[PDB]
Design a protein around this ligand. Structure first.
Ligand code: BEF
Ligand SMILES: [Mg+2]
Length: 219
């Protein structure tokens, strides 16, 4: 079977999709808003995300962006009233794998879900090591079971270090992966963020400097 997430803020439509797919071995969870969608993604694995664009809270576009950035490789189908060519351009630009406009035919949605699921490949990024557990959908961190509040940028840097599994990551790579490609900050922004991150995580030290190279999670 298949498990899919339906993010759609018109409730009778979302329920009709879930209901219409169920006996064809596609089990769907429904989120009526962006915050609920992130809550579901933080705890459940899905085969496909079906995303409305205009929803309360964080938009379907922001959900898509977080899915792509999480490196799960979960395919994204946008299902939306935004039907202009400009809308398709921005949707595919955000990382959608398919784009279906309303009004739509349920059996076409089903055919496209099956086609997406067939061509999904793999290795999800490591998000847990050395007593740290990271959740990229809520941007939350627990260290030995204790919630640690971090800023967005602190979390982005910690994510890269944890994904590296104890391996070394240079300041230049942290720059590339945690600041936008069209940004060009200097390495001092990275070193300053690492210092703040260390202070948030507390003792004992868990991020090690490797002189002249970069930083690693101390395993
Ligand atoms: F509100 Be969805 F973009 F149709
Ligand atoms: Mg909507």
């Amino acid at each position: 079977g298949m498990r899919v997430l339906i993010v759609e803020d018109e409730p009778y439509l979302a329920e009709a999709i879930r209901d219409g797919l169920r006996l064809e071995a596609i089990a769907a969870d429904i989120a009526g808003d962006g915050d609920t969608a992130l809550e579901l993604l933080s705890v459940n694995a899905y085969d496909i995300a079906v995303l409305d664009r205009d929803i309360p809270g964080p938009s379907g576009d922001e959900i898509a962006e977080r899915i792509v950035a999480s490196g799960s490789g979960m395919p994204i189908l946008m299902l939306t009233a935004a039907d202009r060519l400009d809308d398709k351009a921005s949707g595919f630009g955000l990382g959608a794998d398919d784009y279906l406009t309303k009004p739509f035919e349920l059996q076409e949605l089903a055919l496209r879900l099956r086609a997406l699921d067939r061509r999904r490949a793999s290795r999800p990024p490591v998000r847990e090591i050395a007593g740290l557990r990271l959740d990229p959908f809520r941007r939350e961190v627990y260290r030995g079971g204790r919630y640690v509040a971090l800023t967005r940028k602190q979390f982005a840097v910690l994510e890269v270090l944890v994904a590296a599994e104890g391996g070394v990551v240079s300041a230049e790579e942290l720059l590339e992966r945690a600041w936008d490609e069209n940004a060009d900050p200097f390495t001092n922004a990275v070193r300053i963020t690492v210092s703040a991150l260390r202070k948030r995580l507390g003792e004992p030290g868990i991020i090690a400097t490797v002189p002249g190279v970069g930083y690693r999670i101390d395993t």
